[PDB]
């Protein structure tokens, strides 16, 4: 059973390697930032049973770049290209590769400032927890055939 924390930390590690701006997880930290921070969160998870002991999972992950200093939109257009390079077909989390099904991107204004919203979806199958009792092997088989 894969952990969401591990996925988030792997993505944060990729971002830390390939970028110099700071990456935050809480809304409080981004308001204290002086300029050009990152915000990463898991947007939605949908879980559906496909077999008796396995589930199908779709996860939406959102990466936001918020330019605080004035006149930083061309940086917003370069960062999208870098992010497009980073995430292509799959990402590797705890010796597992998870397929990427689609990528969506938008540039809109939140309150008074425009921001970049980069999102992509992951799809994979995971197994559910269960407890099974133990039996010993058959040692004696007694069959009697009447008449």
């Amino acid at each position: 059973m894969l952990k969401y924390k591990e996925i988030l930390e792997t993505i944060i590690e990729i971002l830390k390697k390939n970028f110099t701006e700071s990456i935050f997880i809480d809304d409080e930290s981004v308001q204290g930032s002086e300029g050009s921070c990152f915000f990463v969160s898991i947007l939605s998870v949908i879980c559906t049973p496909v077999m008796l002991n396995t589930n199908n999972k779709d996860i939406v992950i959102s990466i936001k770049y918020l330019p605080k200093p004035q006149s930083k939109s061309i940086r917003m257009y370069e960062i999208s290209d870098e992010l497009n390079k980073l995430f292509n077909r799959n990402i590797k989390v705890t010796d597992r590769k998870l397929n990427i099904t689609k990528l969506e991107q938008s540039i809109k204004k939140e309150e008074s400032i425009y921001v970049l919203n980069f999102t992509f979806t992951l799809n994979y199958l995971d197994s559910v927890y269960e407890e099974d009792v133990v039996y010993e092997n058959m040692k004696e088989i007694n069959l009697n055939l009447g008449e």
Binding site: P49, V50, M51, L52, N53, T101
Partner: protein
Amino acid sequence: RNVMSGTWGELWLDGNKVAEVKKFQAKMEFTKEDIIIAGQMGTDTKYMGYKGKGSITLYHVSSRMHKLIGEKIKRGSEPRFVAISKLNDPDSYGAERIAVKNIAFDDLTLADWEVGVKGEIEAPFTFTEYDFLDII
């Protein structure tokens, strides 16, 4: 006190449990001949026999059917198999086990894939015999 849910379904094929199974179905279709009796307006029927039909749907996880039938089919020898299905819903009233015997499959899928689609296999078959275990 619920209707049985197919989420609690298990299948054994050729003595091996099939971990990846999506749905199972088996049906017996009777053969009936129409008989008109003198002096009777309603048309009656005579029972002559039946034909067994079914299919299995499973996710593409291994080459199960290939190993089962592919090499033997080419040489002109056809194998037969036995299947056991179990439906045991914890909320339902009880379990139901049925054995389906003398199974002969209808086709073999070598490859079927599409971009962006997770693979599935559906395999129709015909059978002749059955047995009741743990009927409710």
